Amino acid sequence: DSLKWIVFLLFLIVLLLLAIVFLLRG
Amino acid sequence: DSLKWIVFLLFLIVLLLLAIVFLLRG
Amino acid sequence: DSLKWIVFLLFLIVLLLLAIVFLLRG
Amino acid sequence: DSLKWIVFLLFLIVLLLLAIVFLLRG
Amino acid sequence: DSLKWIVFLLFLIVLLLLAIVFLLRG
Ligand SMILES: CCCCCCCCOCCOCCOCCOCCO
Ligand SMILES: CCCCCCCCOCCOCCOCCOCCO
Ligand SMILES: CCCCCCCCOCCOCCOCCOCCO
Ligand SMILES: CCCCCCCCOCCOCCOCCOCCO
């Protein structure tokens, strides 16, 4: 359903922001 | 409906975060 | 109602990420 | 109310991205 | 609850953007 896609995309956004945090720290 | 818009905008946010990750890395 | 604010704020987030992409690319 | 909390956190995300945009301009 | 997961992930996204703001300042 729609809510499952919303949770999935928010989880990808968390993973991408994690990458950005690590790239900035480096 | 609103949920279709929400999913679409979250997907655009994923794409823009991917672009940022790629710009940071390069 | 909440759903209309949610769509509006996601849309501002899209615009703000576009601005970040633009600044990084410069 | 979960929906109201969602509006609030999206609003903080807008604020934080505006802060980032400002820091990136200087 | 799906809404609870959404609130949780949005909170993580806030914390990650706070981390990014702090890294940009120093
Ligand atoms: C509206 C259909 C879905 C398209 C999403 C784009 C939304 C763009 O918003 C335009 C900016 O509107 C300016 C003023 O907005 C008032 C805030 O609306 C909050 C709800 O009461
Ligand atoms: C390089 C600078 C780019 C500036 C991006 C600004 C995006 C808009 O966010 C401003 C938020 O503060 C105002 C609240 O939103 C106003 C509603 O009108 C938005 C027009 O669509
Ligand atoms: C606008 C900044 C003021 C700071 C207070 C928090 C505002 C965040 O949301 C502002 C938009 O209005 C929120 C509406 O959504 C929840 C309120 O519910 C009202 C009755 O259901
Ligand atoms: C920099 C972010 C906050 C700066 C001023 C905050 C002052 C707190 O009061 C805000 C009151 O505003 C009420 C709701 O904001 C506008 C949304 O309502 C318009 C249509 O619903």
CB C21 within 8 A of CB B16: yes
DSSP symbols for chain A: -HHHHHHHHHHHHHHHHHHHHHHHH-
Nearest CB partner across the interface for A17, out of E3, E6, E13: E13
Contact state of D9 with E11 under an 8 Å Cβ cutoff:
yes
CA of D10 to the centre of ligand 1 (A): 15
List Cβ neighbours of E9 (8 Å cut-off, separation of 6 or more): A7, A10, A11, A13, A14
DSSP symbols for C1-26: -HHHHHHHHHHHHHHHHHHHHHHHH-
Contact state of E23 with A25 under an 8 Å Cβ cutoff:
yes
Q: How far apart are CA E23 and CA E3, in angstroms?
A: 30
Contact state of A7 with E2 under an 8 Å Cβ cutoff:
yes
DSSP symbols for E2-26: HHHHHHHHHHHHHHHHHHHHHHHH-
Q: If we measure between CA atoms, which residue out of B1, D20, E17 comes closest to residue A6?
A: B1
Residue the block writes with tokens 């990750």: B21
Cα–Cα distances in Å, from A6 out to B10, C9, C21, D17?
7, 15, 23, 20
Which structural technique was applied?
A: X-ray
Q: How far apart are CA D7 and CA D17, in angstroms?
A: 15
Q: How far apart are CA A26 and CA E10, in angstroms?
A: 25
Query: Residue D18 corresponds to which tokens in the numbers above?
Result: 């505006």
Q: How far apart are CA B26 and CA B22, in angstroms?
A: 6
Give yes or no for residue D7 CB within 6 A of ligand 3. yes
